[PDB]
């Protein structure tokens, strides 16, 4: 199995990263009756979903990890007959409405208005059902406007624990009604300790423990990425982490690095068309354009042949075109504009 989902902690006491965030989640779980709506924000791969699961385990007891998957059908005005999978379980419900698309309003106005009007009276404690909204930052600003009053009015029988990263595109009313829980990413020491736990449990033979440190610095505070890297390296090296084991990286990262090298080396219109071809290839793989722009910028800023003026111009164009892409429809225009501006500023 995947080592990410085979060593995931399943309790609040099995979560070893931040002692301060566990001691606050335990305080929240001490009196579950007055639990407010929670918004967990932090870097990706920290373990916000695992901590949400541990909080649900501490509140509702065990049995929150047995997930049943049912597909619910929603009909728009044009009778498109849209679709959405609803991962659910006893005592809690999980939804990622942003996947539905721009029609996430039609699911937060149906599921979140039908489970908030059930009162959960079983056979007399009404209790509340915790709804986890994965990727709360991907809502189209209309799902949140129909959610604020929904979770304000029906707070007696429902609680919302929204999981998101970089909670900038979340509107102020949502953040006002939600208790914001910051989840800092672990340092390299904690990641190395966790990787040590995995390698002694999996009995793989490592040498020069520094390798786990290397994986920690390469993952950039991402436990999921670090564990996937460790599993790939162990499998490719036959369960033997040699000191010269190649730190494998995602292919799109290498392609973006090659794009940065092409931009630095060649600055012409034909090179710009080749960059467009690379960008279209990346876009065809459902890679978000904001992440592509961020990786391109932070890989162009790592070039040692560029002076301070060029790097300042690159970061200024990056901010401008990121704001342009956030308020646009077609991202290819913004990506080409950023690449062309970088090419013009470099030469």
């Amino acid at each position: 199995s995947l080592w990410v989902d085979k060593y995931r902690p399943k309790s609040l006491n099995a979560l070893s990263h931040n002692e301060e965030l566990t001691n606050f989640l335990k305080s929240l779980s001490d009196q579950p009756r007055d639990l407010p709506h929670l918004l967990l924000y932090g870097p990706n791969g920290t373990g916000k979903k695992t901590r949400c699961m541990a909080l649900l385990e501490s509140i509702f007891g065990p049995g929150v990890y047995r997930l049943k998957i049912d597909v619910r059908q929603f009909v728009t005005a044009s009778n498109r007959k849209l679709e959405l999978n609803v991962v659910s379980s006893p005592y809690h419900l999980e939804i990622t409405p942003s996947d539905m698309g721009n029609n996430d309003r039609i699911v937060i106005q149906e599921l979140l208005k039908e489970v908030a009007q059930m009162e959960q009276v079983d056979f007399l404690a009404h209790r509340y059902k915790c709804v986890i909204i994965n990727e709360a930052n991907s809502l189209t600003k209309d799902a949140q406007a129909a959610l604020r009053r929904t979770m304000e009015k029906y707070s007696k029988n429902i609680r919302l624990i929204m999981v998101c990263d970089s909670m900038s595109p979340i509107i102020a009313p949502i953040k006002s009604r939600c208790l914001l829980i910051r989840c800092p990413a672990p340092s390299d020491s904690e990641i190395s300790t966790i990787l040590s736990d995995v390698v002694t449990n999996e009995r793989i033979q490592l040498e020069t423990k520094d390798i786990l440190k290397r994986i920690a610095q390469a993952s950039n505070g991402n436990l999921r990425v670090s564990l996937l890297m460790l599993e790939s390296m162990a499998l490719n090296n036959e369960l033997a982490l040699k000191s010269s084991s190649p730190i494998i990286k995602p292919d799109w990262i290498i392609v973006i690095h090659k794009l940065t090298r092409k931009i630095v080396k060649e600055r012409s219109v034909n090179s710009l068309i080749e960059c467009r071809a690379v960008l279209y290839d990346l876009l065809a793989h459902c890679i978000p354009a904001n992440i592509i722009l961020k990786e391109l910028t932070f890989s162009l800023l790592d070039v040692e042949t560029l002076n301070t003026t060029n790097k300042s111009s690159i970061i200024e164009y990056s901010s401008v075109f990121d704001e342009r892409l956030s308020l646009g429809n077609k991202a290819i225009f913004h990506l080409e504009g950023f690449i062309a501006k970088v090419m013009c500023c470099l030469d």
């Binding site: 049912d70 009162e119 009276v121 056979f123």
Partner: protein
Amino acid sequence: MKLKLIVNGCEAPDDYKLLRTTINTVASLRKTAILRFNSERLTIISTPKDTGQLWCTIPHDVFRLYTVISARELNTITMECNCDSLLSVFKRYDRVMNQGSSSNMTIKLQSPICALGITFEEIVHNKVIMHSFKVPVKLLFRAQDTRIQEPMINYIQLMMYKLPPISGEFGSAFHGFIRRVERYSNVNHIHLMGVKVELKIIVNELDWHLEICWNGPLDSVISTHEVIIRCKDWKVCSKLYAAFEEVVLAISHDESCVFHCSLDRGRERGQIIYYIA
């Protein structure tokens, strides 16, 4: 996997009419149905998985022949069959016996997708006409079979009401009571009420408010009980009560509603349960 059964409508009218009561309901509810052939009993299931679920129990003594063998537990094989074709075949046999006949149904499982060899005979007036039909069905897996279980209903201190039989003096009055709300075109929600014995059909909306009442006698074998239900489920309840003498109504406070139907074959009794959320 060998499945073979023989039905005679003229030999036993009650168990046969309950089979007509089960097939019409699963045709009216939704397309396709689930048929689990347990070695001692049959159960015809229409699972939409808010929409209601029906769980009708059919014993093994209803048919002349109930030879059922399979490699699964208790000789259980589960079919998925389009209800339109079997309903048409069943209507054909209804017309066969209406014109005057006493022939039986030979139904055999002839081959995961299979079919049932529902063949019978008809005589016009001393002529031999053989009616052969093949309804394509699919074989549900055992792992898929155990995913389907009957909804549970409890009454810690709730309230089931004994609906008067349709053969009595008040049976037609209660049938008119149930069908009174069905006359209105623009109705989608009905609010049932429970007082302990009176039950009322209440439909309150923005600009109009129905409040139908039953002033006749009622019985409750051995507190407020209200539920919001759809109109189509009420139509299904009307159709189920029209063909049943013993009808049991239980109302839960804002949780669910159950329409229980039973035929006293005594012998195992055939029962129809309509779970409504």
